[PDB]
């Protein structure tokens, strides 16, 4: 039973809690009982939902891609034909989880992926096909798939998950960061070079996923859309940051677009208005 | 008795006095410390060149000229030419350092104006082009001169709009980072003590900036009538608990 | 074989359910957690940090003057500023309090409002910061402002007043979204005496307004925010 407000009466004193100096960079914990006469109230509240494992720990959509089950005879590279699709795993392509994560500089969490696959036949199908998706977790250095059915999909050491379309996949991935936390922000470079990329680092590299329909093909085409949902768990967060105000433009960069809209709402009246 | 305004910081053979200070900020209430054995991964015995590098290095003074937008310095980049600390930064593969950052701006009781002196860990700068354009190495590594935020955009450089903190956030929300104000009414001095803040125990000091120091005028400089419409701002930075590991040849950076 | 019955909601993906799932990486040993300063366990920790309010959002562009509340010399009894206290809207929408408040639907507890005087040290001002609890309008003359919760602020060697907004909502939480039933009331500053400037100094001096949360502050019913948006997925 935490006290929210103490009972305070009239004070006429030299102890003045409500005068301070913001120059010191501190926020004085000034209570309501410091400047008005209060009564005793209780919190009845523990702050469990603003906990960072509750805050970062529900499933956000992080990626939507499409793969096609299709006749592959006479197709050059099979990735432009969407016969398979690889996704470099990041939590910054879709901005709703990105803004929550980038409230912190460093974050460490075990991941928990939920992959939903949904099909559609936009033209001339007699039936909806019972399809199976392979989601192969591809770490950096693994051979990337170049065909939808090459040797890489054997996955003797890569983690794969088979699941039906319409059904969903679910697997947790541990914290796979090389450092003690992921870098949401990286003020630097991979090396001392005049042309190397800024901010794009392997310190938030989480692996990659490769997706294909494992079925061969039917007479009609099937468009399978994959929706990876990420839930962070065992979340640890460091260095709270200023929240994002402007729209993002790219993965891994703090860039904002040119000639953007003002984010502070202009008041209708003057500074005196309500 | 003793004032909270009269402070002395002695580091090495360097001393800073102030008689118009605020209370010094220790970032996240953590004093700089050497790397303990339980956190270390690098197996080299680190060199701790204590009084020769952990000492105050005064940077070039900035003139705050009533239309100034602000100034950003990068650490350890602002101290890459500063004595033995600058040399150990290039001869070693690795290094970790905390900082005492001290910012000076004196004025008369007739002056007004307020500086935001803020320390931002991993201040990843935005490009002025948007999209996926990166900032070149020489622009996030300016050294002693820092980044003048009132200067124009240069191709390959960061965006210099002070309202968006050069990173797409807002200026008012920088106070979540460890900061002080130099309000000329109250203090002429901002003192911020920074620990080593990184996801790694020790890191490359030349390709990575751990923290940035931004000195931002919030309330503009109003000088009294007939006075010089300019105040010098001096930034004095001392490394603290500085380790260096992996000694090799002197690394050549872009300049 | 155990006879089981399958319930409703079987095979559903509730995105907020917190279950155990198989690991794709058995026997993986993650990187040792080193000590990093500034660990956050709870967002109620960091909304007790005061951040600047853009009270002067009277421009057509985001600028530093939006954070600057102007004071003027020869002014008795007038209003310095006024605002409503919808903390997920208005001047508060972009502050750190208001950004984290917009991830939640309900808020309770007391606000912490700071003003920082930034004029010259030989200037003097007395201001009166009024909180009007809801039911009445936004005050119009300083006479109806001081009938509510107010602090008279003499400006001297300490440049910062800290006015709390005490909690007025028997409906135990309010909405973070602007809702008329759960309006928090009005905030206004008035010239108590006036701003007196020293000789050889002219013009305006500025106030800096800060907002934070008291430790009795509550947030619940986590929701998506209206701040960030997206048309297409971002690329590398």
């Amino acid at each position, epitope marked *: 039973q935490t006290v929210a407000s103490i009972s305070s009466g009239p004070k006429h004193t030299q102890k003045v809690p409500i005068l301070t100096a913001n120059e010191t960079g501190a926020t004085m914990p000034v209570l309501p009982s410091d400047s008005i006469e209060t009564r005793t109230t209780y919190m009845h509240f523990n702050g469990s939902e603003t906990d960072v494992e509750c805050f970062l720990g529900r499933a956000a959509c992080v990626h939507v891609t499409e793969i096609q089950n299709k006749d592959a005879t006479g197709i050059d590279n099979h990735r432009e034909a969407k016969l398979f699709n690889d996704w470099k795993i990041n939590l910054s392509s879709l901005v709703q989880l990105r803004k929550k994560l980038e409230l912190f500089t460093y974050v460490r969490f075990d991941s928990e992926y939920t992959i939903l696959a949904t099909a559609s036949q936009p033209d001339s199908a007699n039936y909806s096909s019972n399809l199976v998706v392979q989601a192969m977790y591809v770490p950096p250095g693994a051979p990337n798939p170049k065909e939808w059915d090459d040797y890489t999909w054997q996955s003797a050491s890569n983690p794969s998950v088979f699941f039906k379309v319409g059904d969903t996949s679910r697997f947790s991935v541990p914290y796979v960061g090389l450092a003690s936390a992921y870098n949401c922000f990286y003020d630097g470079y991979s090396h001392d070079d005049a042309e190397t990329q800024y901010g794009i680092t392997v310190l938030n590299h989480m692996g990659s996923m490769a997706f294909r329909i494992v079925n061969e093909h039917d007479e009609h085409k099937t468009l399978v859309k994959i929706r990876v949902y990420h839930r962070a768990k065992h979340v640890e967060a460091w260095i709270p940051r200023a929240p994002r105000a402007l729209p993002y433009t790219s993965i891994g960069r703090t860039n904002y677009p040119k000639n953007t809209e003002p984010v502070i709402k202009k008041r209708k009246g003057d500074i005196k208005s309500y | 008795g003793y004032s909270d305004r009269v402070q002395q910081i002695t580091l090495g053979n360097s001393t800073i006095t102030t008689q118009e200070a605020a209370n010094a900020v220790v970032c996240y209430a953590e004093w700089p410390e050497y790397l303990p054995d339980v956190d270390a991964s690098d197996v080299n015995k680190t060199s701790k060149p204590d009084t020769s590098v952990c000492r105050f290095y005064t940077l070039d003074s900035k003139t705050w000229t009533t239309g100034s937008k602000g100034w950003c310095w990068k650490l350890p980049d602002a101290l890459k030419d500063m004595g033995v600390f600058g040399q150990n930064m290039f001869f070693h593969s690795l290094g970790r350092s905390g900082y005492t950052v001290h910012v000076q701006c004196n004025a008369t009781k007739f002056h007004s104006g307020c500086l935001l002196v803020v320390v931002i860990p991993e201040h990843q700068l935005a490009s002025h082009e948007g999209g996926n354009v990166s900032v070149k190495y020489t622009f996030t590594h300016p050294g002693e001169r820092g980044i003048d935020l009132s200067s124009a955009n240069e191709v390959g450089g960061p965006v210099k709009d002070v309202i968006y903190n050069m990173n797409g956030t807002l200026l008012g929300n920088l106070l979540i980072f460890p900061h002080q104000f130099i309000n000329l009414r109250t203090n002429n001095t901002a003192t911020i003590v920074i620990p080593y803040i990184n996801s790694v125990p020790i890191d490359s000091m030349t390709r990575h900036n751990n923290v940035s120091l931004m000195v931002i005028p919030i309330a503009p400089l109003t000088v009294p009538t007939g006075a010089t419409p300019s105040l010098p701002i001096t930034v004095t930075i001392a490394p603290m608990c500085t380790e260096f590991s992996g000694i090799r040849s002197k690394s050549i950076v872009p300049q | 074989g155990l006879p089981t019955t399958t319930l409703p909601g079987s095979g559903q993906f509730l995105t907020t359910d917190d279950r155990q799932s198989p690991s794709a990486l058995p026997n993986y040993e993650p990187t040792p957690r080193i000590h990093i300063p500034g660990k956050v366990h709870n967002l109620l920790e960091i909304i007790q940090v005061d951040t600047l309010i853009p009270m002067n959002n009277t421009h057509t562009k985001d600028e530093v003057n939006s954070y600057l509340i102007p004071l003027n010399a020869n002014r008795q009894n*007038e209003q310095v500023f006024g605002t409503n206290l919808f903390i997920g809207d208005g001047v508060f929408k972009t502050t750190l309090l208001g950004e984290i408040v917009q991830y939640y639907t309900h808020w309770s507890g007391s606000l912490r409002f700071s003003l920082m005087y930034t004029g010259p040290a030989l200037s003097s001002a007395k201001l009166i910061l009024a909180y009007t609890p809801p039911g009445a309008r936004g005050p*119009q003359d300083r006479r109806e402002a001081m009938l509510g919760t107010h602090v008279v602020w003499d400006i001297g060697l300490q440049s910062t007043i800290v006015m709390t907004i005490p909690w007025t909502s028997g409906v135990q939480f309010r909405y973070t979204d602007p809702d008329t039933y759960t309006s928090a009331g009005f905030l206004s500053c008035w010239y108590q005496t006036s701003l007196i400037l020293p000789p050889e100094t002219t013009g305006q001096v500025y106030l800096l307004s800060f907002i934070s949360a008291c430790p009795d502050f509550k947030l619940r019913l986590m929701k998506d925010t209206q701040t960030i948006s997206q048309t297409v997925a971002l690329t590398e």
Partner: antibody, heavy 116, light 107 residues
Framework: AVQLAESGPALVAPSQALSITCTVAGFSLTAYGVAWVRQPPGAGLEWLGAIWAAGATDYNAALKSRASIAKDNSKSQVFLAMASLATADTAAYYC??????????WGQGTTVTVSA | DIVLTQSPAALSAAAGATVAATCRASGNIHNALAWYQQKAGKSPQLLVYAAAALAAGVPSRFSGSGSGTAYALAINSLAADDFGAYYCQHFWSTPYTFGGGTKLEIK
């Protein structure tokens, strides 16, 4: 509808007093101040003075001895009184509601001719 | 006091040109400057407040710029409605003195 309607005698003998009024509609004088600006024909605008939202007044530095601005908050009338007129006071006089302390909502203006 | 020196006295131009009127102040206004449009025999109309921000119902041809003591009012592609006399006024405490005035004429 924020309106500031000037009204004056418009024909004043020199070395006399002005009694130029602005009846205020659309706002209250307790909340917004009123600026006064004249413009002689051919020449440019001259700021005469401002009464602020609670009766504090500021004036043109060359006309502090002549001009005096007062108001009635209940009658919504702001008064401009210029004593000891000269022939260079022939001007169309304007009122303005204050708007971020800037003057706008300028009235139609009444021309005053100071002649004998 | 603060003297506003507005320059030049007159600028004759045709419809569709780029015209900049300039006010130089004796002291720093800190962007507390207003630009006014006055047509022939009409009340002054506020175009730009805070030296850069367009007022209510002002077309986007007008653009205020400048800071400190120097301030510019630029018009892109003059229309026929944009002719008349233009005035600065600063608002830095008091007195709120005007500039001299720029009259826009037709070639």
């Amino acid at each position: 509808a924020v309106q500031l309607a000037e009204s004056g005698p418009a024909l004043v003998a020199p070395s006399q007093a002005l009694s130029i009024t602005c009846t205020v509609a659309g706002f209250s004088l307790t909340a917004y101040g009123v600026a006064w600006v004249r413009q002689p024909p051919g020449a440019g605008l001259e700021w005469l003075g401002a009464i602020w939202a609670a009766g504090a007044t500021d004036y043109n530095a060359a006309l502090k001895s002549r001009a005096s601005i007062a108001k009635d908050n209940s009658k919504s009338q702001v008064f401009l009184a210029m004593a000891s007129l000269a022939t260079a006071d022939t001007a169309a006089y304007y009122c303005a509601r204050e708007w971020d302390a800037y003057g706008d909502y300028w009235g139609q203006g009444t021309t005053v001719t100071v002649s004998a | 006091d603060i003297v506003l020196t507005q320059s030049p006295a007159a600028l004759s131009a045709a419809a569709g040109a780029t015209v900049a009127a300039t006010c130089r102040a004796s002291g720093n206004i800190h962007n507390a400057l207003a630009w006014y449009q006055q047509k022939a025999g009409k009340s002054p109309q506020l175009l730009v407040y805070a030296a850069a921000a367009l007022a209510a119902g002002v077309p986007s041809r007008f653009s205020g710029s400048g800071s400190g003591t120097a301030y510019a009012l630029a018009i892109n592609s003059l229309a026929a409605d944009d002719f008349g006399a233009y005035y600065c006024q600063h608002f830095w405490s008091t007195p709120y003195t005007f500039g001299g005035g720029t009259k826009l004429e037709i070639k």
